[PDB]
Design an enzyme around this catalytic site. Structure first.
Site, short mmCIF file in Angstrom:
data_model
loop_
_atom_site.label_atom_id
_atom_site.label_comp_id
_atom_site.label_asym_id
_atom_site.label_seq_id
_atom_site.Cartn_x
_atom_site.Cartn_y
_atom_site.Cartn_z
CB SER A 140 -0.93 -0.07 1.23
OG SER A 140 -2.00 0.88 1.16
CG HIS B 279 -5.71 -2.69 1.45
ND1 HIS B 279 -5.03 -2.49 0.26
CD2 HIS B 279 -5.19 -1.80 2.34
CE1 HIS B 279 -4.16 -1.50 0.42
NE2 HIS B 279 -4.24 -1.06 1.67
CD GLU C 76 -5.57 -4.31 -3.05
OE1 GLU C 76 -5.47 -3.63 -1.99
OE2 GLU C 76 -4.65 -5.04 -3.46
#
Ligand SMILES: *[C@@H]1O[C@H](CO)[C@@H](O)[C@H](O)[C@H]1NC(C)=O
Ligand SMILES: *[C@H]1O[C@H](CO)[C@@H](O)[C@H](O)[C@H]1NC(C)=O
Length: 532
Positions: free
Chosen positions: A197, A437, A324
């Site tokens: 990320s 995610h 995600e």
């Protein structure tokens, strides 16, 4: 002594740790910069002055000052990401896990945590480097960097709060690894930086920035790329948000010097308490203080640096998870909650798309809605919910990553793309969130090999296969074993665009990852918004 190492900054003493019925050494909390406190708040980091005596590196350092998720008190799903140490602005340290006996010159892997540039810690349980150092015989390093306003408040032109200082913190830790990892048995000419990320976006940012490229050899990006819509802002937007922060703390706004002086008198928690108030729109997947396109760390816009090949040319391995967007809708879109299936009505769907593409005008919102609505069954609440999950994930993670990958591959030396779609059997989050995610991280750091954690045998196997692809790619530039009989992860090429799945079933190769939706997000929507 195996636990004592002499480095250019002084001597450090480690500690012996058990892992999977054996042991390795850990040097935790080694300092790589002067504490960025008082007058140094918002400033570029200064190198740590060498010390006398032995630095005790037997326990974890403090975590940097940051917002703390209290959305589900006591729930381990959200709490495992919060700081598990006391917070402090004195937080610039790194951690090293080293095989035993101490290697002479082995492959190094440096981890850069995610957390939207507003949070994150190197000390979380899921970031424990011992399974990977031990299982793959690599020297594992994890760094830390200032987040939030402390790391990214940007008043371009001032040398007191230039912006990007959190990126300069990571660069300094990378410089320290280049300079000293040899004493811990690491090979400084073979370091791979990897992160997830914002950590994955940071990795791509060091590949872009001329000042960072010489400090590492190869890169791995998980669910993040430098050009993501939430990963940077212009100097004008950075400045406008810095002044608005000032205005929230009733500061004197007549000059950069006066604003910065006021902000420096404030206690950490005062800035953290009003940080969210400066976003320009009602939105999700947007963070207040992030990297700024300043002309220094980034010489020109990210897009033109990518078009002209202005970046480090090497091998990269990167990818995404299947769902995600679910985390961000759960936390901020109407109709979603942790304990229901979250079926979404047409009206919450409409509210959701407005929040997900905050910079779009009406025609823009209409194009997105059409692109993700099955008009033969528009009131299906599960389709509306999953439709929204895909909008958030495609716009914020997958399509920006696919654009980065297609631009990089044209000039790079090797690309390997993956699509991680296995839902852990012990996940505590509800089913509707899918493969969330951040949940490929526990498989990358090897948690499934510790029985007490409750994973299935095939999950332990998936984790060993991922750890071995990551470490082999770090050692050689290719995740595949030279003469293995195992199935080949093919190279991604401009022409064929192959990638592979990562899950408990037999590897399958595919092509053109989400190409239909990414032509909409990368070519059509931007042209529609520039014309209207
Ligand atoms: C990587 O670079 C080397 C030499 O610079 C070359 O022999 C090889 O073909 C390259 N590999 C790819 C996939 O571009
Ligand atoms: C440093 O390590 C821990 C920190 O609390 C503790 O046992 C002691 O304070 C120190 N140990 C040594 C060997 O200096």
């Amino acid at each position: 002594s195996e636990l004592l190492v002499n480095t250019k900054s002084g001597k450090v003493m480690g500690t012996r740790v058990p892992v999977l019925s054996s042991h390795i050494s850990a040097f935790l909390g080694i300092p790589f910069a002067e504490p960025p406190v008082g007058n140094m708040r918002f400033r570029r980091p200064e190198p740590k002055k060498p010390w006398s005596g032995v630095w005790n590196a037997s326990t974890y350092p403090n975590n940097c000052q940051q917002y703390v998720d209290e959305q589900f008190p006591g729930f381990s799903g959200s709490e495992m990401w919060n700081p598990n140490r006391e917070m402090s602005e004195d937080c610039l340290y790194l951690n090293i896990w080293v095989p035993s006996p101490r290697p002479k010159s082995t492959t190094v892997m440096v981890w850069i945590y995610g957390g939207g540039f507003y949070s994150g810690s190197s000390t979380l349980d899921v970031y424990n480097g011992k399974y990977l150092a031990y299982t793959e015989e690599v020297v594992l390093v994890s760094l830390s960097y200032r987040v939030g306003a402390f790391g990214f408040l940007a008043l371009h032109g001032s040398q007191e709060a230039p912006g990007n200082v959190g990126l300069l913190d990571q660069r300094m830790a990378l410089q320290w690894v280049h300079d000293n990892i040899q004493f811990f048995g690491g090979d400084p000419k073979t370091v791979t930086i990897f992160g997830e990320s914002a950590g994955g976006a940071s990795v791509g940012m060091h590949i872009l920035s001329p000042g960072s490229r010489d400090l590492f050899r190869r890169a791995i990006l998980q669910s993040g790329s430098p050009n993501c819509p939430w990963a940077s802002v212009s100097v004008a937007e950075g400045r406008r948000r810095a002044v608005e922060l000032g205005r929230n703390l009733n500061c004197n706004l007549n000059s950069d010097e006066e604003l910065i002086h006021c902000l420096r008198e404030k206690k950490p928690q005062e800035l953290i308490d009003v940080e969210w108030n400066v976003l320009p729109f009602d939105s999700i997947f947007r963070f207040s203080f992030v990297p700024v396109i300043d002309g220094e760390f980034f010489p020109t816009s990210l897009e033109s640096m990518l078009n002209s090949g202005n970046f480090k040319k090497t091998q990269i391995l990167l990818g995404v998870n299947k769902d995600e967007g679910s985390f961000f809708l759960l936390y901020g879109a109407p109709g979603f909650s942790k304990d229901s299936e979250s079926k979404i009505s047409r009206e919450d769907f409409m509210s959701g798309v407005k929040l997900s593409v905050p910079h779009a005008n009406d025609l823009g919102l209409d194009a997105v809605t059409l692109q993700y609505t099955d008009w033969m069954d528009d009131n299906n609440g599960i389709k509306n919910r999953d439709g929204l999950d895909d909008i958030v994930g495609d716009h914020n993670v997958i399509c920006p990553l696919m654009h980065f990958v297609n631009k990089y591959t044209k000039f790079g030396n090797g690309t390997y793309l993956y699509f991680f779609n296995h839902r852990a059997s012990n996940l505590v989050w509800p089913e509707w969130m899918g493969v969330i995610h951040g949940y490929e991280i526990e498989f990358v750091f090897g948690l499934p090999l510790v029985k007490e954690l409750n994973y299935t045998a095939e999950e332990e196997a998936l984790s060993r296969r991922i750890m071995h692809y990551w470490a082999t790619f770090a050692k050689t530039g290719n995740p595949n074993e030279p003469h293995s009989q195992e199935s080949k992860w093919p190279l991604f090429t401009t022409k064929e665009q192959k990638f592979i799945d990562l899950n408990t079933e037999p590897m399958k190769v595919h092509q053109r990852l989400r190409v239909q939706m990414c032509v909409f997000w990368n070519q059509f929507l931007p042209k529609l918004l520039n014309a209207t």
